[PDB]
């Protein structure tokens, strides 16, 4: 197993994971290393395809020129998972586009074929025991794990060897259910992998760890002390959001409701949806039909990114805010979802001082709806650092990566390469 | 799958 850890059945959440020493924060509980890993299609060029490593001057790969390496070694061990897609890439051409899921998929049944024994990525829990909530599937979900193998078949027949229909409904399911999305310190999106030990954990939403990746390497650290007996939770889902929309999500993707103290005392759910201390105060009504205004909203930008020019997505953020600060206060949360959606599309067309001037109205309240160390704080700040530094404001820049920095040694732990990268970037300038 | 964004 795991020193200081242990396998145990949790009431009402089925199997978990246990502390049988203290853990103080920043301190590292275990590491995992990935069972079955894919480097995001958009990624390729930036970092390796075998370790993860971000760098300069990435040797391609000769047959199919769309995978890159540190080195002819990261290329040698890559090739046992690269193979199922090299040649398919050129043949299919243009028309190679499976899924993120399906692509990881692959990964996993070629891994189960080449390394059917438990893997060290599996001390406390195996793939093959991955919980996968097949039957709570409805029609749209089976529809959808549907066209994931139909991909599968499409794409993957010429190297793997595929179970009956079954069984890749429940993997998929699994991986639905179990997966991770492997981020950097951005939090941008870098690729998806399988954790099982990292898997074992439980939700909450006042988690006491956190996951981080050191390549494809999962690292978990206390972020609240632990001691022994207690559970350790950590959370699934972005934590801005108040219980009923974070819970929407869990049901919807994960099959469970949570209990935690968050969800049961709502504490954090006012000033997430402040409301504006108006001479007439909003009515109940009023409030219920922004919040779903609200919602419709974000749904409706996250399908118009998809093909709507920068200006109309930066129109559909300025005209939105517009309609909800009437009720809203600067500091709601669907007010900062579009300030943030608006910073990233600044972002994208290089209007570094629109970014900055958006951050800037987002950072605090971000601070004060999430949990002490948070990801999302840090990589805020981050961002903000970053493009302080980029604009020659050094006592600015310094100052918010140094935030970065001190929430980042706790929850990456102090000798992490991203802090080393963020160090050198505050002594450079 | 299980992202904090
Ligand atoms: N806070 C919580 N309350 C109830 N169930 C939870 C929970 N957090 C996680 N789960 C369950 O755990 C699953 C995520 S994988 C986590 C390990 C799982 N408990 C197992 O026995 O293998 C989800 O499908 C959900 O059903
Ligand atoms: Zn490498
Ligand atoms: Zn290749
Ligand atoms: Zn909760």
Request: proline share 4%; hydrophobic share 35%.
């Given at each position: 197993g ?23 924060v ?5 590491s ?16 390796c395809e075998?370790c993860?490593?971000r760098?300069?001057?990435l ?37 190679w ?6 692509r ?10 080449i390394?059917?024994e ?12 991955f ?14 794990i549907q ?19 079954d ?9 639905n259910?179990?997966?991770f ?10 690729g ?13 939403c006042c988690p ?25 939770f950590?959370?699934?889902?972005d ?7 974070r ?13 935690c ?23 109940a009504?009023?409030?219920?039909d ?14 118009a ?20 600060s ?20 600044c ?19 971000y ?22 530094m980029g ?21 990456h ?14 002594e450079?300038? | ?5």
């Amino acid at each position: 197993g795991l020193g200081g850890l242990e396998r145990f059945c949790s009431p009402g959440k089925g199997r978990g994971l246990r502390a049988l020493q203290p853990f103080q924060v920043g301190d590292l509980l275990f590491s995992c290393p990935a069972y079955a890993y894919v480097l995001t299609v958009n990624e390729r060029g930036n970092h390796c395809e075998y370790c993860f490593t971000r760098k300069e001057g990435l040797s391609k790969c000769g047959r199919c020129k769309q995978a890159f390496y540190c080195n002819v070694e990261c290329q040698k061990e890559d090739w046992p998972m690269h193979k199922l897609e090299c040649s398919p890439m050129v043949v299919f051409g243009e028309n190679w586009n499976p899924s993120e899921t399906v692509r990881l998929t692959a990964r996993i049944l070629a891994k189960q074929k080449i390394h059917p024994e438990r893997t060290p990525s599996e001390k406390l829990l195996a793939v093959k025991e991955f919980e996968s909530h097949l039957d709570k599937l409805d029609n749209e979900k089976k529809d959808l794990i549907q066209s994931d193998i139909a991909a599968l078949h499409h794409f993957y027949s010429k190297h793997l060897e595929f179970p009956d229909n079954d069984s890749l409904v429940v993997l998929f399911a699994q991986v639905n259910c179990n997966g991770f999305t492997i981020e950097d310190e951005e939090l941008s999106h870098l690729g998806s992998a399988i954790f099982p030990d990292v898997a074992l954990m439980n939700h909450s939403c006042c988690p006491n760890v956190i996951v981080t990746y050191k390549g494809t390497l999962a690292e978990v650290r206390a972020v609240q002390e632990i001691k022994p007996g207690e559970e350790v939770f950590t959370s699934y889902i972005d934590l801005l959001y108040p219980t009923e929309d974070r819970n929407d999500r869990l049901r919807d993707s994960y099959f469970f409701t949570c209990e935690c103290q968050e969800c049961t005392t709502k504490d954090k759910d006012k000033a997430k949806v402040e409301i504006r201390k108006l001479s007439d105060p909003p009515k109940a009504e009023a409030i219920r039909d922004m919040v779903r205004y609200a919602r419709n909203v974000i749904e409706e930008f996250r399908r118009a990114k998809h093909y709507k020019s920068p200006s109309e997505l930066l129109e559909i953020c300025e005209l939105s805010q517009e309609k909800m600060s009437s009720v809203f206060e600067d500091s709601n949360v669907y007010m900062l979802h579009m300030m943030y959606q608006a910073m990233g599309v600044c972002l994208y067309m290089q209007d570094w001082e629109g970014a900055l001037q958006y951050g800037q109205k987002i950072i605090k309240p971000y601070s004060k709806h999430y949990p002490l160390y948070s990801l999302n704080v840090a990589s805020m700040w981050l961002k903000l650092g970053r493009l302080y530094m980029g604009l020659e404001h050094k006592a600015a820049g310094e100052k918010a990566l140094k935030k970065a920095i001190a929430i980042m040694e706790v929850a990456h732990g102090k000798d992490h390469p991203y802090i080393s990268e963020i160090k050198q970037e505050i002594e450079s300038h | 799958l299980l992202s904090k964004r």
